């Protein structure tokens, strides 16, 4: 028995094993576009993914991660509200059972079909494990997905999902370019938050892009064929692996645009 997204172990339960779930800077949150403040001081984001080296793609029981080599500054994020260099370690998605839900963050209460998270850690702290223990340890780039036209750059990921259907399964996944998942504009909101699954550590600077990226219904449908369970166990479909919006509390959401 452990945390998950079921009826008896879902987000509403998590606080029993992870008290920080009721913390002061939990994520996700609803972004109220009229209360967000434009900050002229925010510099443009600097995304350098030209040397990214993907290694593998694995089904960890609550989502699937596409892991990168983070032993050097190959794929990094700089600028924006960040101070220093953040290395990309993995990206994953959260999606729903229906096109009307799936994203973790919402915009004026609007939910998207899914949300892509590109996780980076602050190199000053030496490794990922140390970085999550710091208030400025992680930077997570969030991108919304809406259902419409297919996204060519995502098909490579969609095609290998069959090989990692169940929990614990992994597959080699080299030469994948994450630049094919980025929207045209890099305008963003940003706020201090946490990691949206256990252990919900409040070490994250969140950078949520304003412009969604479109994926086809067929592509999202393949996400919904994955399993939370391990092979040989009763099938439960991996859907609705998103945490509901949390109280903003004493936080301000800033926008890089007006
Ligand atoms: Zn996530």
Curated annotation (Swiss-Prot):
The active site is at 62 (proton donor/acceptor). SUPFAM superfamilies: Carbonic anhydrase. Changing residue 60 to L: Reduced activity. Residues 1-257 form the Alpha-carbonic anhydrase domain. GO terms for cellular component: apical part of cell; cytoplasm; cytosol; extracellular exosome; myelin sheath; plasma membrane. Changing residue 197 to H: Higher affinity for bicarbonate. Enhanced proton transfer capacity. Substrate binds at residues 196-197. The modification Phosphoserine is found at residues 163, 170. Signal peptide: none annotated. Changing residue 117 to E: Strongly reduced activity. The record marks 90 as: Involved in the binding of some activators, including histamine and L-histidine. The keyword Acetylation applies. Activated by X-ray, histamine, L-adrenaline, L- and D-phenylalanine, L- and D-histidine, L-His-OMe and beta-Ala-His (carnosine). Changing residue 3 to A: Impaired activity, not rescued by 4-methylimidazole (4-MI). The keyword Transport does not apply. Optimum pH is 6-8. Its cofactor is Zn(2+); Co(2+). Belongs to the alpha-carbonic anhydrase family. Target of drugs used in treatments against glaucoma disorder and breast cancer. This is Carbonic anhydrase 2. It comes from Homo sapiens. The gene is CA2.
């Amino acid at each position: 028995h452990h945390w998950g997204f079921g009826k008896h172990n879902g987000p509403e339960h998590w606080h029993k094993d992870f008290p920080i779930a009721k913390g002061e800077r939990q994520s996700p949150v609803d972004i109220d576009t009229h209360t967000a403040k434009y900050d002229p001081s925010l510099k443009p984001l600097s995304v350098s993914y030209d040397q990214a080296t993907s290694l593998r793609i694995l089904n960890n029981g609550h989502a699937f991660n596409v892991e990168f080599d983070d032993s050097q500054d190959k794929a990094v994020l700089k600028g924006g509200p960040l101070d220093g260099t953040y290395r990309l370690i993995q990206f994953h998605f959260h999606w729903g059972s229906l096109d009307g839900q799936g994203s973790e963050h919402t915009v004026d209460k609007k939910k998207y079909a899914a949300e892509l998270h590109l996780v980076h850690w602050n190199t000053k702290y030496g490794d990922f494990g140390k970085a999550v223990q710091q208030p400025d340890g992680l930077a997570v780039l969030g991108i919304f997905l809406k259902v419409g036209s297919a996204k060519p750059g995502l098909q490579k990921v969609v095609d290998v999902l069959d090989s990692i259907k169940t929990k614990g399964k992994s597959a080699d996944f080299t030469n994948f370019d994450p630049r094919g998942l980025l929207p045209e504009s890099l305008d963003y909101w940003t706020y201090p938050g946490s990691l949206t699954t256990p252990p919900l550590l409040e070490c994250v600077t969140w950078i949520v892009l304003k412009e969604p990226i479109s994926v086809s219904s067929e592509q999202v449908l393949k996400f919904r064929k994955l399993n939370f369970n391990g092979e040989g166990e009763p099938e439960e479909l991996m859907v609705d692996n998103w945490r509901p919006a949390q109280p903003l509390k004493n936080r301000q959401i800033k926008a890089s645009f007006k």
